[PDB]
Design a protein around this ligand. Structure first.
Ligand SMILES: Cc1cc(C(F)(F)F)nc2[nH]c(=O)c3ccccc3c12
Ligand SMILES: [Zn+2]
Length: 208
């Protein structure tokens, strides 16, 4: 039931999503091992993701969380990158793959840094990189990220040295406390708490 609508590069909406992608690239402590070496992207396509059922699922859960959190959904726009992106756009986020988890436990992870989500496009640790060249820093092959509407509700703040939610909380905020340029990561435990609003097709660019 999913439709993808191309945005024009002349459209303010395209431009805004591109700027959020470009402006949230940072350096990573792996020197580029997982995601590649780059400071910016070549954005090839930005599509709006339209699915009435998945949207309704999301707004129903958002209402539940908002009411539990004293009329505050605490809704954000966040990146998600993974090998599941093609499944997600059609069937929604699925918490039966929360067990994979990460530094903040089982759950579905989102990032404020686009470049953090870029590290997961080819799997955990970048997997073995792109299918065609087996290169985690491939400048040729096209990548995809989602830019998602995410309901955090009452979020448990977890400082980081870089499953069900904590009792009474709807999500976890993983906040790096050592790297002062690293933005937060977030974890949800119900797939209905995120909607994949934009599908972004891009290349990382080789620094000049
Ligand atoms: C931990 C993890 C695992 C996976 C998965 F296993 F590949 F699905 N995808 C992720 N995708 C992200 O966009 C992200 C953002 C911030 C922190 C972690 C993650 C993340
Ligand atoms: Zn490649």
């Amino acid at each position: 039931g999913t439709i993808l609508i191309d945005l024009s590069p002349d459209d303010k909406e395209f431009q805004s999503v591109e700027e959020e992608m470009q402006s949230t690239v940072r350096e990573h402590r792996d020197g580029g091992h997982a995601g590649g070496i780059f400071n910016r992207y070549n954005i090839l396509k930005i599509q709006k993701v339209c699915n009435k059922k998945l949207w309704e699922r999301y707004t129903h859960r958002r209402k539940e969380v908002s009411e539990e959190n004293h009329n505050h959904a605490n809704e954000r726009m966040l990146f998600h990158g993974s090998p599941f992106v093609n499944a997600i756009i059609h069937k929604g986020f699925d918490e039966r793959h929360a067990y994979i988890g990460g530094m903040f436990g089982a759950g579905i992870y989102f990032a404020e840094n686009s470049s953090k989500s870029n590290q997961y496009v080819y799997g955990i640790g970048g997997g073995t990189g792109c299918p065609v060249h087996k290169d985690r820093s491939c400048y040729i092959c096209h990548r995809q990220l989602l830019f998602c509407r995410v309901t955090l509700g009452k979020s448990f703040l977890q400082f980081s040295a870089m499953a069900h939610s904590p009792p009474g909380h709807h999500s976890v905020t993983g906040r790096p406390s050592v790297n002062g340029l690293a933005l937060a990561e977030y974890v949800i435990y119900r797939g209905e708490q995120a909607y994949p609003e934009y599908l972004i097709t891009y290349q990382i660019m080789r620094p000049e």
